[PDB]
Design a protein around this ligand. Sequence first.
Ligand code: FCB
Ligand code: CA
Ligand code: CA
Ligand code: CL
Ligand code: CL
Ligand code: CL
Length: 290
Amino acid sequence: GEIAVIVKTVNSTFWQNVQKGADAAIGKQKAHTITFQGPAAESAIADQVNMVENAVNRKVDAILLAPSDPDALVPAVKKAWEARIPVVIIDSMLSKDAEKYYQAFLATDNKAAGELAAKAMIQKVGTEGKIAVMSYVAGAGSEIGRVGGFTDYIKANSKLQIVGPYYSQSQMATALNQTTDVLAANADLKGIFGANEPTAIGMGRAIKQAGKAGKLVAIGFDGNQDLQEFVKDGTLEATVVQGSYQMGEKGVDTLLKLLSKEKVEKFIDTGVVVVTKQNIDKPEAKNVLY
Ligand SMILES: C[C@H]1O[C@@H](O)[C@H](O)[C@@H](O)[C@H]1O
Ligand SMILES: [Ca+2]
Ligand SMILES: [Ca+2]
Ligand SMILES: [Cl-]
Ligand SMILES: [Cl-]
Ligand SMILES: [Cl-]
């Protein structure tokens, strides 16, 4: 009675909060259990494909998948569908090609979330000057909309010059180095966007280490303890926080509905909160912080 939860990496406070939500949902019923697995890094795409294939081959009851690539994971998800195994996608989209093969998609509206981050950037930076974009895995499902939404909004609503994008591969240490390097290369940098949890943490640490905290406008994504501290201490002006717990909890609950041959909502927006010093202790923020 296995429900296989497969995420981009287990080495992550973000994915551990998704696990928390999944654990909560599963613990309210007896018939199914979950496994929680992911490769060693978000860039390990082939390893994730192997995990999904293996789940199909051992005939799990259902799969909750945060695909590390929107295209590379399609063949394995098609195999799940051919095996009559319900699949729900969380966090990061699959290609349009795959639409027939899974039954729900729960995620941030990433284009909208990138736009909120860009608007926050402009309101603090203005509309002239240079900003840097620190991204994670190029073309990963959540990344396309998030960074594209950000970038397109900056272009349409300012004459800010974008430096980058740079790609951290979701490695904190890589983001730290890339940020250190962008700062050293661009003395006139007015702002900097870190598009996911590890990238934003490395970014914040780089800014602090460079002696530049508060001397340019930094905006992040996600809401773990490090990022909360960076908002509170003024290193980051804002961080855009997702419904990570909800993706796990409602992800599992959606699969449980499908396993009972019930109707589900195919596209579920798990919401966002832009967290700043002005709202960090409000209930709406506390509900998504972790
Ligand atoms: C580490 C984690 O960061 C979240 O921001 C992304 O939504 C998710 O796809 C993953 O990259
Ligand atoms: Ca313009
Ligand atoms: Ca360097
Ligand atoms: Cl790979
Ligand atoms: Cl999206
Ligand atoms: Cl993806």
